[PDB]
Each structure stands twice: as structure tokens, then as C-alpha cells.
Design a protein around this ligand. Structure first.
Ligand SMILES: [K+]
Ligand SMILES: [K+]
Ligand SMILES: [K+]
Ligand SMILES: [K+]
Ligand SMILES: [K+]
Ligand SMILES: [Mg+2]
Ligand SMILES: [Mg+2]
Ligand SMILES: [Mg+2]
Ligand SMILES: [Mg+2]
Ligand SMILES: [Mg+2]
Ligand SMILES: [Mg+2]
Ligand SMILES: [Mg+2]
Ligand SMILES: [Mg+2]
Ligand SMILES: [Mg+2]
Ligand SMILES: [Mg+2]
Ligand SMILES: [Mg+2]
Ligand SMILES: [Mg+2]
Lengths: 294, 43, 162, 272, 249
RNA sequence: UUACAGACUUAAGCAGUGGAGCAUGUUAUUUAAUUCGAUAAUCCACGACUAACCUUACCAUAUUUUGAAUAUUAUAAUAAUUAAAUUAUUAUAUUACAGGCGUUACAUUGUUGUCUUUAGUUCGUGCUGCAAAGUUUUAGAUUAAGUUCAUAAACGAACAAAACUCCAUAUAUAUAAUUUUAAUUAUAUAUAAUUUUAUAUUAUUUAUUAAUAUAAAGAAAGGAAUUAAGACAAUCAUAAUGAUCCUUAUAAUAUGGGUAAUAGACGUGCUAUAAUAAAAUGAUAAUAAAAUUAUAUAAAAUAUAUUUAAUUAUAUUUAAUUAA
């Protein structure tokens, strides 16, 4: 289409009007333009080519194959910065990727909380605020292979909220011990269980439990007695919220099997007073508690 | 490269290939493996 | 009213326009050569656009037979195993012909396209000038000179004496 | 102005960035021939606020140079950020090559949109030389942007029957041209690249043409009418080119078997 | 599509460091030899010294010699780590560091610019375009030169456990498949935006006899509606993301 | 130590070759030199992109000595700069050196080679075992063969094959004012197949199946490149780095010679040992492709061998073309 100078003079710069006039006097209005399917001369988008883009066009004053300035008339005298910054926002960050501005600020508890929430539906806030994690066993194991000895880091950790909920987790990593602890912490939260506690301080009565080669003898204790038990049992009691306990481990004292045996004993070897009363159809009275009641 | 020290007096260029050779010469002098003094035709 | 896109900008998005040949007087042959076709074709398209505005009827780019050069490099084994790597170079050729144009306009075409040439493209131009049989004012080798000098030197004159 | 950078006296009153740009231009354009000037330093001190550089430092930096800055820094030990993490702010060099390709395309597109149309001012109407007064054709060759020995070559070609020679003189002309005449095409072609310049070679061929025509038109002594034209050279050339000189027999054509255009009402109705 | 667009493929001419064609083969051989020699010379001009203990090594890629009919453009990528004045001040705005002095003799120096010297060696106009790369892992040639020449104290007694770790955290591990599929979706969207534009411009009618020969669909604006420089170019550009890297010592 | 399958190889079949002369490489021997190229007992040291000079690395004789480089310090000749000194260039001289086909019994690195590996590792998660660990069906089916497809408390990613990609082939569009003509072509772009469907037969894991044949549609029938490791070879006269040795000589130049010697031996070729095969002749000229021509390709013609002429060889002359 051929347009009158008035219209074309309201959209295009004066410097380009002469070129438009000459083109409208050399190309007949009835020109049937054909599309080339061998050579693509124009870009894949529409452009009047009246403005120089700061990025998609050559930089004015910069030397290059098609620079029209004389060699003594270039205007780039500083070379410490990139001449043509990226267009638009200034970045090419892929959709769904984040610029790594900050590194080393992650909390492994928050990483465990986010992953478990997505995988199991547990509340992240409870994991990151209510739970305490204590490593119990940290050793290196090795497998003999044809290539050679392959070492691995083994971590056994216990987590708990100090209010009845405790869990045991194990983790392995061939790379570093920190990765093994992360997996163990992850596993421990998934294994969280509630343990009955008498007066939220001790166990119900005494427990004689056999876990593989470990013989566990645990006795309930008076208020203010403290934890007088194997060190492995001490850590578990701390996380679980057991304050008063006495006990002795016989036969095997393997730390790993003491920890698992203890967790199992607290669940499979205890019976609440309420559960005993309902099963037998009898009333069970705590004499010490009644003595100080109204 | 030898013409650069007069074309551009302001800039100080370093020839790493030449510099490497000169260090290897000094090293051999320190080990006693230097080059024999060349005989003079006058002799 | 939307922004008007004039015919000059629109032409860029379509195949280059060609002017009809009226008389058929071939005035120039422009042969372009490159080791790759992509710049060769793009530059050829630009020449057709330059000629159109200059009023030069142009034909082409006619593709001419591609020349293939080959080289075989025997490798270290030469044991009749994968012991001969092959290499090749292809010269791509294009011919653009100009018709019924005055010499001055033809020189403007060559000057402009020379100023805005692409990397790795070569250009040969054959100009054809029709002239009259009789013109006005029209349109010794080094070895021979030395031979005369040598034959005058005494080492040769001393024998030529008759 | 282009020469403003050479006149630091005239920088006073220019905006802060313009003065710095003119200071950078004088250093780049002069290089080792650069000598500190008071006027230049006076203008740079006026930019201590645009850059927030202490007015004292400017003076040292202007007289010391990089060493001065290293002293102001207090040390020369800057962290080695050679393996720093990528901030998705720059493009790979291979992607920068594809952007350069696109910068070139846009450069040519802009020329075709607004620069090529201006060439229409130089259009000249073809002043065709009459085919009868201008029968000779001089071919010149130009290798653009190259020094090539063949650029000197000039070729001259003409149809003998357009030379205005009588019958007897035309025969003598063709006899004396020998291998330079092709009877089949009637073309007399001679080329010369003996001289170093095309103009010299063009004159040389022109002079030979006049000499050949003069001898051919001087039939006072010999006309070489007894001597028949020798075409052996043309025959040898013809044997090296394949001749497809066979056409479909006319008595084999069956025009009655050609498809007959059918009647399409739609096209017949769409035309009215 | 990919090879018919300048933003979606690398021109084969770029596969060669000397981009030239001369009818005179001897002149082509000479130009090729001149490009290797100048490349070696430039490698020797990259090492600069301010003082005995301030040696700045600029890492330069191989040169791209673009030989056109009228000029020769020598394009190269360079990396420089500014270790002398890497501050937050604007003191660099009042002096020319050694790297700026070196870059300004390529074209700007009025008396002894390297371009004029080379213009006589090549007998043609010569321009030099230095292009700065900010990271050393954006060009394979620069990356190899840096390691080879500057990281020797890290791998001369085995590859340091920290050195290797840095060479493995350079880039976040982008998902190539998701990036590859995002690119293909954008192309389909752009391709379907132009087909819809024409289908609409045809169904709306923008000589019946001429309606069987010409293929002109209508105004350029309508055919390319919603296809501008602000959305098409950056989405189709290829080789935009580093997705893999293998280093060896 | 058992069993299984598949290899590479094997022999089988077919078509060529095995001795003679000569060409060429190696060995041995000879030689002033016949430059260099191999030593942990099967065999076996091979450079045909051109060794008269050059090449050249070897021998004889003669000759050169900071040499081809960079720098230092002097001396000059020269041009600028600066008020005669400075700086530039050049030459000469000076001394660190330069140079070295000297050294793998000169240590490492490259390079390329061969060589197995190439559906297997590592990682994430899940699951089993108190645990080291394992991740199970499965010692799956199928193909010439990861070939192709199934399947299991495993699932997925990366990895690489594969896909993909290019070439060829068929077709479409564009380009050529169809005398640069081969339009029966040239070369850009696009499409096509890793073919498809019905039917009968034989097997099957018998079903929505393979092997088969039958019918139909189709131009459709062949190739290329491709991972990372592991174990091993080569001096690369095809690039390095160090150490080590020569420095009036193990460096450099010239003339001539040698690498071309000849008892035996070996490899690889050429021409032959005649009639399913050799030799002549075949001009309106039976029928190609791929290349080459500015450090050129050389037409036709004439002359001589040489005879009517042709043929073959050379000379004379140097047409056209630096090229669809
Ligand atoms: K001889
Ligand atoms: K696992
Ligand atoms: K034809
Ligand atoms: K010899
Ligand atoms: K025979
Ligand atoms: Mg001639
Ligand atoms: Mg003949
Ligand atoms: Mg021919
Ligand atoms: Mg010799
Ligand atoms: Mg000799
Ligand atoms: Mg040495
Ligand atoms: Mg020697
Ligand atoms: Mg377990
Ligand atoms: Mg799996
Ligand atoms: Mg020999
Ligand atoms: Mg024939
Ligand atoms: Mg002849």
C-alpha cells in the first residue's frame, strides 16, 4: 500500500521520508510480492528498522566488519565493561530457575522439613522448631570389591520432641558423613513414634526386653532421680522426654542394637495404667498421687 | 615483538617464551651445566 | 489507524523484485564464489535488491556447478585399518547477469556491493562493452633487453668479431 | 566537535560525563604522546562530585596513574574470581556468534529499507548503442578486491558479416584470421593479455583489427579467392562437445490425442 | 527453520578461523599464513606488566579473520581479571589501566595503531574488534588457556580437592530436557501465531482470475501481528545455556 | 571348579594368485659412505604423494666461528626529538648464548595406534536385613547382533548408545532472458520409509502374535559419522617439556660421491608363457565419470622420422581459456 506523505510523516523520522518517497515512486502499487522459500532476508518478526536496538544491532562506534565509521573515528575508549548488556530484564534465567545470589545459608533441618512435607505431608514447622536431633553412631564401613575397597559413612541418629515423640533413623553415604547424617535425620523423622510415659517423666514399671543379643533391664524411678543408664539410652531418653530412669545392659552392648532395642522396648514392652484397667475391668490407683489429692 | 618496545613506549610487554628461556639458562649456570666459553678467532 | 508500513520496509520481507529485460544486451557477468552457500546466497539476494533500485535488469542468482577439492591424509598406522582420513573443500558459485544498463550505473552497482560485502565471498566481474569497428585514439620484454646487453658485453663481442 | 578532545581549554562548562569522555579520548588517541595538561586537570576536578572521588585523589590519579590507584587501594591483592558462579547475565561465546549473525542481517535489512531506495536518484535511461554501428564487443575482467594477473586480459569478438566488408574482402579476412574465425557461428574472436594493463591490451587488439581490415580491403595484389576456407580447427573443437542434434519426428505427432479442456461452470460463472 | 534463521544455527563460515575466498589461490594462501602469524603475535601482546610484581595476563581466544571484498576484520574474545583496582570507587574513571592502553592501540591511537601496520601487511583496510567475556567458562579456548597457564599451582601436585570442587559448582545443574521442551513449545507457539494471523487475514478477505495466481496475503502488519523484537528474538536464540562440561589435566 | 550361550576364528564353497624375467622394499654383505629405521625363543625389523644436483639426514675435501634469536654495553652512519645534547633506524663490535637428524640405557607429556568395554556405572528416592550389605522376577523372551519387546520392591535421573543427523535415491518449489546449454542439467529449500494393509498356512506365551506364502499400495533398495573407561604398542624423519652431552664443532657453507654397491634370502607389484585370445583396421567420428589448467592446460596447422595419407614421436608455431 502507498501512503500519503502526511500519514508517513507522523510515524517515521524526517530523515527516512525521502527513502520512503523514492520507494513509492519506483515500486508500482500493483506489485505482487512473492515470498522466498530459499533465502530468508528479513527477520522472523516485524520491524520497521527505524530505531537501533542497543543489543540486537551493532553498537554505534564499535569496530566490526560492517562498521561505517573511519578507522580514526571510533568512540569506544573504555574496555573494562561488556559493551552490549543483555536486552530486556538483563538476564536469561531459565523459567523455574533462581539466580544463585546467596549460598551457604541453608539449614539442613529446613531441607529435611521441606522434603518430608512434600513426600509424606508432615508439617515443616514442627520438624524445624519442635524436634531435637542427636547423632548416636557415626562410623565408616567398607565393602571389598574387585576395583578395591569402597568406603561408606554410616550415621545413626535419634530425633524427638521431648514430649513423647521419638524416632530412630539410619543413613549411608559414600561421599561424606554430612550426607549420611542428613539421610539419618530424614529417616528418623519418618520413624517418629509416640512412647507411653508415666506422669510424662518415666516408664510404667520395669522392662526386661531382649533385642537380638542385647539384654535391656530398665526400671522406673522416683521424681528427681535423673537418668542413670547406658549413655546410648540416655540420649534416647532425653529426646523422648524421659527424665527418671535406671537400667543395666547385659550381654551385647553394641550401640546400634541398644538404641533400636530401647525404642522397641518403650513401645512393645509398656502398658499404660488405662490399658491395663480396661483389659481387666479393674480400677488402678496411683497411691502416691492420691495421697496428695484433695 | 622486538619492535613493540619502540612503537609503544608507554606499554611494557613481556615475552614469556623469551623469559622462560632466560630462566633456563640461569638454572644451568647454577648447576654448573652452563655453556663453555666460545673460542675467539683471534686465538 | 495502525502504524503504516511503507513499501520499502515490506519489500525486505519478500523476494527481491526484478526489472524486465527490454533489449537483451548483456552488459556484465557477476560470479560470486564462497566455501559456504549461506553467505553466498544472502549476499546474492542483496545484490538483486541494490540493482532494482538502480534500474538494472538482473537475472539470477544462477547456481553453477560446485567444485570439490579432495585430500587424503594417511594416518600413523597405514595398516589398512582406519588409516586414511579424508578432507574436502567445496567452492559454491553463483552467477548474476546484468542487462541493458549504462556503464556508469553498472559501476555504481559494483561500488556499492563492494562497500557492503560479506565475509568469505569472492567476486569476479566480466564487463561487456559494445564498440565501433574504428575508434579514435584506440581503446621490449625484460629478457629481450638483457639479451641485447649480454650480446654487447665484451665476453660475447670478443667472439662475434668477424 | 571531532577536535574538541584536542582543546582542553574549551572543556570548561561541559557536563560531567562529557568531560570524562573527552579526557578518555585524548588519552586513547595520543597514547605515548600524551602529556598532562593543567586545563585538563582543572576540568576533571570539576567532576569530583559526578564520580564522588576525593578532589585530592583525582590529582594523584591524574599524575601517578595505575600505580597511584594501587597506593590509594592500599594493596594489590584482589580475590581471584575466575571460577565464580554464573549469574545468568552474559551469553556464551557461541551464542554471541549467533547474535552477531543477527546483527549483520539487521544491518543489511536496514540498508535495503532506507539506503537502497535512495539509489533510485541515479537511474539513467539505457542509451543503447545501435547494433549496426557498434558491432565489436570488448570483454573486460575485474577481480574485485584482489590482485589477479588475468584482470589485464581483454577479449575482442565480432561477427564478420557485420564488418561491412565486400564479398571478396570478407573471404580474405576469414582466411587471414585462421583459427580465430569460427565459420559455424561467424564469430571472429581474439584475446590479448600480453601487456600489464587492460587499456594497453584493448588498444593492441584494436590496432590488429584495423590492420587485418586494411589488408582484407586491399585486393590490388592478392585476394586469396583460390584458397578455400579452412575449418579443421573448428572441426576439432566440435568433436570435444556433445551434439544433441535430434528432434522429435513431426509425422509422429498425434495432436488428436491431447487432453481437451473440460467445461467448468464454476469458473465460467465466477468470471461473470 | 533452524538453518534458515540466523538466530537458530551457526553459519558454517564460522567453523573456520580464516573466512576468505580469493580467485588468486596464492593470495589466499598468503592471507591464511598472515592470519596465523598475527594470531601468534597477538598472543605475545596479551602479557603486560606495570611493575615487577604486577604482571597482568589477558587470556585471548583464537582470532576470527573475516575477509570481505573491501576489508579484513580481526575479531577475538578476551578475558581480563582486573586485580589491580577492583574497588567500588570511581578511581578507574581518571586513569587508563594497562588493559585499556593495550586495547586503545588496536584502532584508536592516531599515530601507531596496530590496524595501520597490519593494513600494509595485508594491503587492505584492517579493523580489530576485541570482545570482552566476563567468565572464563564461556569460551572453550579461553578456559583451557587459563587453566593451563594460571591454575598450574592447583594441579601440579594432583588436582586439589578444592580446585575440582570449584570446577564442578561453576553452573547450576539445569534440566536440559525441560529447557529443551520449553524451547520447542515457544517455537510451536510462534509458528501457530503466524498461521492463525494468515488464516484470519484470509477468511476476512484482507479479480477472481487473479485469485488463482497471486499469493500475496495482505498487509505485513497483520501477517506479523504480535511478533516483535521484544518477544521473538530472545526466545529462539540457540546455545544459550551451558548444560555440560568436561575438563582434563 | 560346573554348565550355558555367543565369539573371533576356523575350515568348506566360489573367483583369483603361487615358478620365469623385470620393477620396488627389506635383509645380509660390501663400502670412504652405502644416512636412519629390530633383541624376554612361533612368525615378523616393511617410509612408493616422486633421492641426478637440491631433497640430505651419510662419506671425502675445503671453508665459517655470537652463527637464524633476544638482550646488554660500546662505536659509528641516518632521521626525528629537544636547545649541541637526547630519541629512531641501520651496520659493526661485545657476552650471556644461538644451534644440534646428539642421547629413551634421555625421564615424563602429547600424538595416534591396537585393544577390550560399550543396556553398564554413579547419583536420588523407596524397600529388605540388627548389620557389613542387598535390591531380588532373571540363569526372561527374541534378533546375525541391544537386535527388539516384555517383566520384578522397586521407580526415576544422569550417562552413552539408539533416536537424531548428513549423503545417496524419488518427488515438489525456486533460480537460468535454455549461446557459459549438459533443462536428459546445475543447487538452494522442502517432503518421503526405521514402509504399509488384507488374506491363507505353520508355530507360539494361540493373541490385537512371529515365521511364511498370496494379494494390494509404494521410486524406495545402500551407506556415513557417534561413549567413556580399561589394558597395551609406537620416536611421531608426524609436536612438545625437562634432564643429559658437543660448543674451532656432535653447530654452519661449498664441490664431488653415496643413499642406485651385489653371494644368498624374503615381501609387494608389473609383463608374460596363444585360438572362450592375441595383433591390425574401423572420419558425417558407438558409448563415460571424476578431475586439472596465473609457480599454466596447450588446439589446429606445418616440418622430420616417412612412405600417397593415416598412425606414433619430436620439433616449429602458441589459437582459445585462468574456465558449466
Ligand atoms: K647427473
Ligand atoms: K539405594
Ligand atoms: K538445453
Ligand atoms: K646421488
Ligand atoms: K595371446
Ligand atoms: Mg593468445
Ligand atoms: Mg587432434
Ligand atoms: Mg569443453
Ligand atoms: Mg644428494
Ligand atoms: Mg651436497
Ligand atoms: Mg639448547
Ligand atoms: Mg647434524
Ligand atoms: Mg533396618
Ligand atoms: Mg533402574
Ligand atoms: Mg633407499
Ligand atoms: Mg563419439
Ligand atoms: Mg596437434
Amino acid at each position: 500500500q502507498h501512503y500519503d506523505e502526511s500519514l508517513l510523516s507522523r510515524y517515521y523520522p524526517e530523515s527516512l521520508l525521502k527513502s520512503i518517497k523514492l520507494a513509492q515512486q519506483t515500486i508500482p502499487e500493483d506489485t505482487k510480492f512473492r515470498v522466498s522459500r530459499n533465502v530468508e532476508f528479513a527477520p522472523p518478526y516485524l520491524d520497521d528498522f527505524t530505531k537501533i536496538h542497543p543489543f540486537w544491532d551493532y553498537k554505534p562506534g564499535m569496530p566490526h566488519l560492517h562498521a561505517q565509521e573511519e578507522n580514526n573515528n571510533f568512540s569506544i575508549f573504555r574496555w573494562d565493561q561488556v559493551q552490549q548488556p543483555l536486552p530486556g530484564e538483563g538476564n536469561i534465567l531459565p523459567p523455574g530457575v533462581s539466580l544463585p545470589n546467596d549460598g551457604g545459608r541453608k539449614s539442613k533441618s529446613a531441607d529435611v522439613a521441606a522434603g518430608l512435607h512434600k513426600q509424606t505431608g508432615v508439617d515443616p514447622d514442627y520438624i524445624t522448631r519442635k524436634l531435637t536431633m542427636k547423632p548416636l553412631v557415626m562410623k565408616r564401613v567398607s565393602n571389598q570389591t574387585g576395583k578395591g575397597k569402597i568406603a561408606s559413612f554410616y550415621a545413626l541418629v535419634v530425633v524427638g520432641d521431648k514430649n513423647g515423640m521419638v524416632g530412630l533413623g539410619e543413613g549411608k553415604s559414600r561421599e561424606e558423613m554430612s550426607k549420611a547424617i542428613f539421610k539419618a535425620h530424614w529417616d528418623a523423622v519418618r520413624n517418629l513414634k509416640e512412647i507411653p510415659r508415666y506422669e510424662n517423666r518415666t516408664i510404667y514399671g520395669d522392662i526386661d526386653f531382649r533385642y537380638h543379643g542385647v539384654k535391656l533391664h530398665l526400671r522406673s524411678a522416683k521424681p528427681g532421680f535423673g537418668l542413670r543408664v547406658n549413655h546410648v539410652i540416655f540420649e534416647i531418653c532425653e529426646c523422648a522426654g524421659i527424665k527418671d530412669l535406671s537400667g543395666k545392659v547385659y550381654k551385647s552392648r553394641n550401640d546400634m542394637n541398644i538404641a533400636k532395642g530401647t525404642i522397641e522396648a518403650f513401645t512393645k514392652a509398656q502398658k499404660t495404667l488405662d490399658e491395663v484397667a480396661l483389659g481387666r475391668g479393674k480400677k488402678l490407683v496411683d497411691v502416691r498421687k492420691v495421697y496428695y489429692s484433695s | 615483538f622486538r619492535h613493540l618496545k619502540t612503537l609503544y613506549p608507554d606499554i611494557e610487554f613481556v615475552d614469556l617464551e623469551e623469559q622462560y628461556r632466560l630462566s633456563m639458562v640461569e638454572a644451568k649456570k647454577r648447576r654448573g651445566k652452563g655453556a663453555p666459553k666460545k673460542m675467539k678467532k683471534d686465538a | 489507524s495502525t502504524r503504516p508500513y511503507p513499501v520499502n520496509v515490506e519489500a525486505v520481507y519478500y523476494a527481491p523484485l526484478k526489472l524486465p529485460i527490454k533489449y537483451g544486451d548483456l552488459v556484465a557477468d557477476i560470479q560470486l564464489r564462497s566455501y559456504d552457500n549461506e553467505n553466498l546466497d544472502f549476499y546474492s539476494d542483496f545484490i538483486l535488491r541494490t540493482g532494482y533500485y538502480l534500474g538494472i535488469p538482473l537475472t539470477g542468482p544462477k547456481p553453477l556447478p560446485t567444485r570439490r577439492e579432495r585430500w587424503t591424509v594417511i594416518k600413523s598406522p597405514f595398516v589398512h585399518a582406519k588409516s586414511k582420513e579424508n578432507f574436502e573443500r567445496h567452492t559454491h558459485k553463483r552467477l548474476i547477469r546484468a542487462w541493458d544498463t549504462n556503464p556508469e550505473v553498472l559501476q555504481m552497482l559494483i561500488a556499492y556491493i563492494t562497500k557492503h560485502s560479506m565475509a568469505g565471498v569472492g567476486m569476479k566481474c566480466n564487463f561487456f562493452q559494445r564498440s565501433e569497428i574504428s575508434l579514435d585514439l584506440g581503446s621490449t620484454s625484460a629478457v629481450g633487453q638483457k639479451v641485447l646487453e649480454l650480446l654487447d658485453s665484451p665476453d660475447f663481442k670478443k667472439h662475434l668479431e668477424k | 566537535s571531532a577536535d574538541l578532545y584536542m582543546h582542553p581549554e574549551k572543556w570548561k562548562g561541559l557536563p560531567p560525563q562529557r568531560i570524562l569522555e573527552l579526557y578518555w579520548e585524548r588519552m586513547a588517541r595520543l597514547g605515548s604522546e600524551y602529556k598532562p595538561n593543567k586545563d585538563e586537570l582543572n576540568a576533571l576536578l570539576t567532576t569530583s562530585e559526578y564520580s564522588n572521588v576525593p578532589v585530592n585523589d583525582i590529582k594523584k590519579l591524574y599524575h601517578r596513574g595505575e600505580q597511584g590507584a594501587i597506593d590509594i587501594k592500599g594493596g594489590n591483592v584482589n580475590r581471584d574470581n575466575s571460577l565464580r558462579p554464573f549469574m545468568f547475565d552474559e551469553l556464551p561465546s557461541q551464542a554471541q556468534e549467533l547474535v552477531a549473525q543477527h546483527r549483520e542481517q539487521r544491518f543489511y535489512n536496514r540498508l535495503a529499507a532506507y539506503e537502497l531506495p535512495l539509489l533510485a536518484q541515479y537511474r539513467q535511461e539505457y542509451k543503447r548503442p545501435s547494433p549496426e554501428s557498434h558491432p565489436v564487443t570488448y570483454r573486460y575482467t575485474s577481480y574485485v578486491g584482489e590482485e589477479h594477473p588475468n584482470s589485464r586480459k581483454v577479449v575482442l569478438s565480432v561477427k564478420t558479416k557485420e564488418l561491412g566488408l565486400e564479398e571478396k574482402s570478407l573471404h580474405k579476412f576469414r582466411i587471414l584470421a585462421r583459427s580465430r574465425y569460427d565459420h559455424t557461428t561467424d564469430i571472429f574472436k581474439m584475446s590479448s593479455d600480453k601487456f600489464e594493463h587492460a587499456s594497453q591490451n584493448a588498444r593492441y587488439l584494436h590496432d590488429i583489427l584495423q590492420r587485418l581490415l586494411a589488408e582484407s580491403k586491399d585486393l590490388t595484389e592478392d585476394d586469396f579467392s583460390d584458397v578455400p576456407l579452412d575449418t579443421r580447427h573448428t572441426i576439432a573443437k566440435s568433436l570435444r562437445k556433445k551434439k544433441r542434434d535430434y528432434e522429435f519426428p513431426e509425422h509422429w505427432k498425434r495432436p488428436e490425442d491431447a487432453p481437451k479442456k473440460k467445461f467448468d461452470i464454476v469458473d465460467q460463472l465466477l468470471s461473470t | 527453520g533452524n538453518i534458515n534463521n540466523k538466530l537458530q544455527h551457526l553459519n558454517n563460515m564460522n567453523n573456520w578461523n580464516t573466512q576468505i575466498y580469493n580467485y588468486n589461490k596464492n593470495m589466499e594462501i598468503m592471507n591464511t599464513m598472515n592470519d596465523k602469524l598475527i594470531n601468534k603475535l597477538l598472543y605475545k601482546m596479551m602479557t603486560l606488566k606495570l611493575n615487577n610484581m604486577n604482571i597482568n595476563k589477558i587470556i585471548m581466544s583464537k582470532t576470527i579473520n573475516q575477509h570481505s571484498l573491501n576489508k579484513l576484520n580481526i575479531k577475538f574474545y578476551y578475558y581480563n581479571n582486573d586485580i589491580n583496582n577492583n574497588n567500588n570507587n570511581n578511581n578507574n574513571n581518571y586513569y587508563m589501566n594497562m588493559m585499556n592502553k593495550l586495547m586503545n592501540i588496536m584502532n584508536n591511537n592516531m599515530n601507531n595503531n596496530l590496524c595501520n601496520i597490519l593494513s600494509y601487511y595485508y594491503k587492505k583496510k584492517v579493523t580489530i574488534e576485541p570482545i570482552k567475556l566476563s567468565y572464563i567458562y564461556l569460551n572453550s579456548d579461553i578456559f583451557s588457556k587459563y587453566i593451563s597457564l594460571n591454575d598450574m599451582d592447583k594441579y601440579n601436585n594432583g588436582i586439589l580437592t578444592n580446585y575440582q570442587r570449584m570446577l564442578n559448582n561453576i553452573m547450576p545443574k539445569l534440566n536440559d530436557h525441560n529447557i529443551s521442551m520449553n524451547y520447542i513449545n515457544n517455537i510451536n507457539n510462534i509458528n501457530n501465531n503466524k498461521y492463525n494471523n494468515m488464516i484470519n487475514l484470509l477468511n476476512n478477505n484482507n479479480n477472481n482470475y487473479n485469485n488463482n495466481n497471486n499469493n500475496y496475503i495482505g498487509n505485513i502488519n497483520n501477517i506479523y501481528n504480535n511478533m516483535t523484537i521484544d518477544n521473538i528474538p530472545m526466545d529462539i536464540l540457540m546455545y544459550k545455556y551451558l548444560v555440560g562440561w568436561s575438563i582434563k589435566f
